[PDB]
């Protein structure tokens, strides 16, 4: 089977290649990652970091551009994998995720797709320590009925795996007045959730040390307040 | 990360504390060494930096199981350094190797360390241990690697297992007393080929052989 | 056709003599049962119930039995080991003594097979095992040579399957507990993640089929070398 | 009378069933043979006694000979006598100490039952039990007259021609260490300890040498009352 | 005088050197430690002792070490075995490898003493037990030779005592049970009918007294002949 790997952090992200090396254990892997209506898109052959040799291309465009391009240069493709994003994509975050966007693009092109993200801010992810779980997760995903569109989040040091629904919460827009060192005032916008994530939600699962996989939908329509 | 160290020579083998100390330069170390079954274990004081230790009245596999329960999560299982080789055909019956295989069977990276008349000078081997650990720690995980360090290494080398055919030499003999017997002195048909673990250690090179778990010969299935 | 029958359960296991008799149906059977070391061996009487077999009880390892065995009854063209009183499936092969003997034979240039059966519970009826035991040797004997196969016969075979070795991952299950005298201990009882995939020795014998797995000698993982 | 029979060679050993059939002449027999102080698990599965003599209850046991004595007394309790053997190999003089056969009997004695260990010198030619049976019966008859409880070690030559009570042979030794080398040059020492005199009359070793069955009453206490 | 020192734990046991070191305080010490009567091959290997008493690691049993010990070092005036990590009291004396080595010494014509300290919990403080090892050794070295004594040192010794082996009746406690995997088995837990008695090594060690018991070689019960 043939797999297209991309992300939105760029071609030097180690999360990209971790995902590539892990995906290669299941098929021929091809890379198309962003560099840094109709429209021209430049792309250049890129040498894969030193490990198996992955045919790669750095694309002077968006991740969605990379999937498109990738499907043309490496067509045919059976699966589009986006990530591993350096940073989580959970709950309300899924909506505007670039990592997720790329995968959603492959899905719209008729392929099966998945986004992978790990929580950041603070300690760096150990992609060496995550491989076993990327594998287990990829293996699990490949048994699903095609096509599928799944959002995956992995904890820094995972202990299991769970299918999850997206965490959905209400927030209080806490705005706290403040004075900077010079003396200029500003507002500290710091939204806090009105409640802990529920069991069964992606957010809940990563907090518990579980890998999280949420099957996504493409329709944002609220069918109940429609008819 | 978190490293569990064990062996099969026991809690007082300087080879265990030489692997443990070497492993402490890469992560936090915990030790569990031998003296659906029941097992007993007792806290034990380490010789040298302080390592949480435990002596397990059981098999080496047991130490690995019991260590993951007591110190888990663990990322790497290191077994050795064994006093005595563990090359070629010998791997099969290796206790040192069987401990690491246990860590592997549990989803963890694992490595076995051994050294072959005279005794090893660990202070002098240390450099090769560190050097060897860093190398191993750069392999995709999980992994299972068999390592043999000669007394005084002069290099490193990723090797394969030496698999030689033998001739069963049996020669009638008799003890000084008078009781007769049979000498079973098997002998390899050829010499260890280049690039195999045994040949490698013979050259004075540290040997590391990734090991598989499937004993199936698919080429005939 | 000459055959050396050995084992690791020792000279009195009914499983050993059960293998010899099934083996004799295909050639002359000989017996030997338990660095350069000295090894003692003595003549041993075969159970007069079956057509006399020259046998020796060896005071050493099963590997010794095969060595001394090819010396005393040489030439031998097939070394059979078992039938072991206990299975030898999946990860168990690695350490099996029955398998080791067959292995030794192979290292010597000969073809070889190890045979095991499930114990701990009830006892194997070798009379009601003779059909499939005989059939298994017919098959084994059709293989290109030399061969090296691990065989496992369910308590009551109803079929036969060439199989792959079962390779499973485990969860290190360690349950605390205390005995009657009050003292504490730990129960180590590892349980595998997934079930035994079909086509594996463990799946075969669980379905009710004799299992036969060709074995290799190279423990190396070339895909990582 | 009830009799528990075991050994340390295994449940398939004919030395085991010979002692069982023999004991079955004096009472009901129950067998428990192989397949640490702290409490330990021990599995035991029913075993079919060979259909060549009057079938007796039996149990294969995944433990030690002593484990056997204990499970037997439990699955067959109550028992009057614990017989262990017939061990394929001798258990004379210095050898009595680390004997698995004697050990099982000692275990029975420590539970307050009379016990005896039976052995037959091996190495070379294996025993003939049809011909030992009379000697097993004769010995057993002799033992059952003893004031109970008793603890006796019995050794029978292959072709006995008499019976004799004996004391343990106690000889001095010399550690013979002669150098040698395998057929590869490699150096090694040949070590064979050997007694410095012939065994004395009245010792177990002398008896069997002469062709007499030997029987020795045993003590539990290893304390040398002399130096104390 | 000259002394041969061994044990059954191996050449790396702290107990062994804690003994060799205390032994050197009375004569030339030589250490031979571990890795049937018919002639068997034995290999020893020069081993660096950590004072400095010549040493060997012997690919053999403890007995082998006494035999080899004398042939490569001997003649010798005394054999010491230990200190064994773990006690060797009462019924235990029967199958102690520590005692068996001193025994192999006596049977060779030399005086011998086996030393032991309880474990199953905390490790011993050898450098903190030296007081009584030297004392225990002085008392013995003055004993009329040849002698054969079994010494048991409690962890925190407050004295000494010549003893008699504690010999006791037992109850074959057998309680069924089942492992976590639901399988049945029997707990066998023997327990003595009563507590040790004054004058026995088992009672003496429980009162914190170093215990020594002279041992006989003949298991014969004369009051039955």
**Domains in chain C: how many in total?**
1
Of B13, B44, B176, the CB nearest to E12: B13
Rounded to an integer, what distance in angstroms lies between the CA atom of residue E17 and that of residue E31?
9
C67 and B139: CB-CB below 8 Å? Answer: no
DSSP letter assigned to residue B55? E
Q: Which helix (H) or strand (E) holds A31?
A: strand A28-34
Rounded to an integer, what distance in angstroms lies between the CA atom of residue A131 and that of residue A151?
17
Nearest CA in chain D to E75: D175
Rounded to an integer, what distance in angstroms lies between the CA atom of residue A10 and that of residue A31?
11
Nearest CA in chain E to B178: E39
Give the CA distances from residue A44 to residues A13, A98, C30, in Å, rounded to whole numbers and listed in that order.
17, 21, 72
How distant is the alpha carbon of residue D50 from its chain centre?
A: 21
Specify whether the backbone of A74 is left (phi greater than 0), alpha (psi in -120 to 50) or beta.
alpha
Documented resolution in Å? 2.6
C38 forms beta bridges with: B183
SS3 at position E21:
helix
Rounded to an integer, what distance in angstroms lies between the CA atom of residue B32 and that of residue B43?
9
Neighbours of C32 (CB within 10 A): 30
Partners of chain C (3+ Cβ pairs below 8 A): B, D, E
Location of structure tokens 């061990």: D87
Residue C68, preceding bond cis, omega within 30 degrees?
A: no
Contacts of D41 in chain B (CB under 8 A): 37-38
Contacts of C215 in chain B (CB under 8 A): 215-217
Of C70, C167, C174, the CB nearest to B168: C70
Location of structure tokens 């007591």: B70
Neighbours of D11 (CB within 10 A): 21
Rounded to an integer, what distance in angstroms lies between the CA atom of residue E132 and that of residue E127?
11
How distant is the alpha carbon of residue D23 from its chain centre?
A: 14
Give the CA distances from residue C54 to residues B38, C46, C51, D126, in Å, rounded to whole numbers and listed in that order.
43, 7, 10, 15
Distance in Å, alpha carbon of E218 to nearest chain D alpha carbon: 6
Per the structure block, which two tokens stand in for A44? Answer: 């250049």
Residues D54, E172: contact at Cβ < 8 Å?
no
Least Cα distance to A35 among A69, A74, A76, A4 occurs for A69
E2 forms beta bridges with: E28
β-bridge pairing B187-188 and B166-167: antiparallel
Rounded to an integer, what distance in angstroms lies between the CA atom of residue D115 and that of residue D83?
6
Distance in Å, alpha carbon of D35 to nearest chain E alpha carbon: 14
A44 forms beta bridges with: A58
* Cβ-based interface (< 8 Å): residues of E facing B: 10, 12-14, 38-39, 45-48, 120-121, 123, 179-181, 183
Contacts of E184 in chain D (CB under 8 A): 43
Nearest CA in chain B to A131: B141
Per the structure block, which two tokens stand in for C71? Answer: 């010396």
Least Cα distance to D96 among D119, D114, D113, D115 occurs for D119
C108 and B166: CB-CB below 8 Å? Answer: yes
Of C190, C218, C221, the CB nearest to B163: C218
Per the structure block, which two tokens stand in for C89? Answer: 């499936």
Q: Which helix (H) or strand (E) holds E41?
A: strand E40-47
Q: What is the DSSP string of B14-32?
A: HHHHHHHHHHTTTSEEEE-
Nearest CA in chain B to C170: B106
Give the CA distances from residue B162 to residues B148, B149, B190, B197, C146, in Å, rounded to whole numbers and listed in that order.
13, 16, 11, 6, 20
A188 forms beta bridges with: A176
φ/ψ of residue E47, rounded to 5: -130, 130
Rounded to an integer, what distance in angstroms lies between the CA atom of residue B51 and that of residue B43?
11
Give the CA distances from residue E15 to residues B43, E7, E122, in Å, rounded to whole numbers and listed in that order.
18, 8, 14
Whether C and B touch, i.e. at least 3 CB pairs below 8 A, reads as yes
Give the CA distances from residue C128 to residues C117, C154, C156, C158, in Å, rounded to whole numbers and listed in that order.
13, 11, 7, 11
Question: Which residues span the domain enclosing D216?
Answer: 1-228
Cα angle vertex A14, ends A8, A16, to 5°?
A: 45
The sign of the torsion formed by the CA atoms of E64, E69, E72, E77 equals negative
Nearest CA in chain B to C189: B36
Distance in Å, alpha carbon of A126 to nearest chain B alpha carbon: 10
β-bridge pairing D114-120 and D81-88: parallel
Burial class (CB in 10 A: 0-12, 13-18, 19+), A180: exposed
Burial class (CB in 10 A: 0-12, 13-18, 19+), D225: exposed
D195 forms beta bridges with: D173
Residues A187, A153: contact at Cβ < 8 Å?
no
Give the CA distances from residue A217 to residues A107, A149, A153, A166, A214, in Å, rounded to whole numbers and listed in that order.
10, 8, 17, 11, 10
Per the structure block, which two tokens stand in for C144? Answer: 């290109």
Rounded to an integer, what distance in angstroms lies between the CA atom of residue C224 and that of residue B211?
9
D39 and C181: CB-CB below 8 Å? Answer: yes
Nearest CA in chain D to B187: D184
* Cβ-based interface (< 8 Å): residues of B facing E: 10, 12-14, 36, 42, 44-45, 117-119, 175-177, 179
Partners of chain D (3+ Cβ pairs below 8 A): B, C, E
β-bridge pairing D58-61 and D163-165: unpaired
Contacts of E151 in chain D (CB under 8 A): none
Over its C-alpha atoms, chain C yields an Rg (Å, rounded) of 19
Rounded to an integer, what distance in angstroms lies between the CA atom of residue E4 and that of residue E76?
7
Residues A80, A103: contact at Cβ < 8 Å?
yes
E181 and C189: CB-CB below 8 Å? Answer: yes
Per the structure block, which two tokens stand in for C49? Answer: 């119930």
Per the structure block, which two tokens stand in for D51? Answer: 């259909």
Distance in Å, alpha carbon of B83 to nearest chain E alpha carbon: 10
Residues sharing a CB contact under 8 Å with residue A96, sequence separation 6 or more, in sequence order: none
In a mutational test of the E interface, the residue from C181, C184, C191 whose CB has the highest number of chain E CBs within 10 Å is C181
Residues C112, C79: contact at Cβ < 8 Å?
yes
Q: What is the CATH number of the domain that holds C109?
A: 3.40.1210.10
Residue C75, preceding bond cis, omega within 30 degrees?
A: yes
Rounded to an integer, what distance in angstroms lies between the CA atom of residue B158 and that of residue E98?
44
Rounded to an integer, what distance in angstroms lies between the CA atom of residue D128 and that of residue B161?
50
β-bridge pairing E184-192 and D40-42: antiparallel
D190 and B183: CB-CB below 8 Å? Answer: no
SS3 at position A131:
helix
Contacts of B82 in chain E (CB under 8 A): none
Per the structure block, which two tokens stand in for E137? Answer: 């050794």
Over its C-alpha atoms, chain B yields an Rg (Å, rounded) of 19
* Cβ-based interface (< 8 Å): residues of C facing E: 37-38, 40, 173, 175, 179-181, 187, 189
Rounded to an integer, what distance in angstroms lies between the CA atom of residue A151 and that of residue A100?
7
Rounded to an integer, what distance in angstroms lies between the CA atom of residue E84 and that of residue E93?
12
In a mutational test of the B interface, the residue from D184, D186, D188, D194 whose CB has the highest number of chain B CBs within 10 Å is D184
Per the structure block, which two tokens stand in for E121? Answer: 């919990």
In a mutational test of the D interface, the residue from B39, B174, B176 whose CB has the highest number of chain D CBs within 10 Å is B176
Nearest CA in chain E to D190: E41
Neighbours of B86 (CB within 10 A): 24
The sign of the torsion formed by the CA atoms of C197, C199, C200, C205 equals positive
Rounded to an integer, what distance in angstroms lies between the CA atom of residue E41 and that of residue D184?
14
The answer to whether the annotation marks A9 as part of a ligand binding site is yes
Ranges of beta strands (E only) in chain B are 2-6, 28-31, 33-34, 38-45, 52-57, 76-83, 109-115, 144-148, 156-158, 166-167, 170-174, 180-184, 187-188, 206-210
Least Cα distance to B39 among B9, B60, B66, B11 occurs for B66
Of E175, E179, E187, the CB nearest to C187: E179
Whether A and E touch, i.e. at least 3 CB pairs below 8 A, reads as no
C122 and D45: CB-CB below 8 Å? Answer: yes
Rounded to an integer, what distance in angstroms lies between the CA atom of residue D227 and that of residue E143?
9
Nearest CA in chain E to C175: E180
Q: For every residue of D56-96, which 3-state class applies, written as one string?
A: CCEEEECCCHHHHHHHHHHHHCCCCEEEEEEEEECCCHHHH
Least Cα distance to D79 among D149, D25, D139, D22 occurs for D149
Partners of chain B (3+ Cβ pairs below 8 A): A, C, D, E
Of E39, E45, E180, the CB nearest to B117: E45
Residues A150, A166: contact at Cβ < 8 Å?
no
B214 and C165: CB-CB below 8 Å? Answer: yes
Q: Which helix (H) or strand (E) holds E57?
A: strand E55-59
Nearest CA in chain A to B142: A132
Rounded to an integer, what distance in angstroms lies between the CA atom of residue D142 and that of residue B194?
71
Of C41, C71, C170, the CB nearest to B105: C170
Per the structure block, which two tokens stand in for E48? Answer: 């660096």
Q: For every residue of chain C, which 3-state class applies, written as one string?
A: CEEEEECCCCCCCHHHHHHHHHHHCCCEEEEEECCCEEECEEEECCCCCCCCCCEEEECCCHHHHHHHHHHHCCCCCCEEEEEEEECCCHHHHHHCHHHHHHHHHHHCCCCEEEEEECCCCCCCCHHHCHHHHHHHHHHHHHCCCCCEEEEECCCCCCCEEECECCCCCEECCEEEEECCCCCEEEEECCEECCCCCCCEHHHHHHHCCEEEEEECCCCECHHHC
φ/ψ of residue A75, rounded to 5: -55, 145
Per the structure block, which two tokens stand in for D89? Answer: 């190999």
């Amino acid at each position: 089977m043939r797999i297209l790997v991309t992300n939105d952090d760029g071609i030097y992200s180690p999360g990209l290649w971790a995902l590539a090396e892990a995906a290669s254990q299941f098929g021929e892997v091809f890379v198309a990652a962003p560099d840094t209506i109709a429209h021209p898109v430049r792309a250049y052959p890129h040498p894969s970091p030193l490990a198996p040799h992955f045919p790669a291309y750095r694309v002077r465009g968006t991740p969605a551009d990379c999937v498109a391009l990738g499907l043309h240069l490496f067509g045919p493709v059976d699966l589009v994998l986006s990530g591993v994003n350096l940073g989580s994509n959970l709950g309300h975050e899924i909506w505007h995720s670039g990592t997720v966007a790329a995968a959603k693009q492959g899905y719209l092109f008729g392929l099966s797709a998945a986004a992978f993200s790990v929580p950041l801010n603070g300690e760096v992810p150990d992609f060496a320590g995550l491989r076993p779980w990327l594998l287990r997760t990829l293996e699990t995903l490949l048994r699903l009925e095609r096509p599928f569109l799944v959002n995956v989040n992995l904890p820094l040091r995972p202990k299991g795996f769970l299918w999850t629904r997206q965490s959905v919460r209400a927030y209080e827009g806490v705005v706290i007045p403040g004075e900077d060192p010079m003396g200029r005032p500003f507002y500290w916008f710091a939204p806090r959730p009105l409640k802990e994530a529920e069991e069964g939600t992606d957010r809940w699962a990563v907090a518990q040390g579980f890998v999280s996989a949420t099957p996504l939908r493409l329709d944002l329509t609220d069918e109940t307040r429609l008819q």
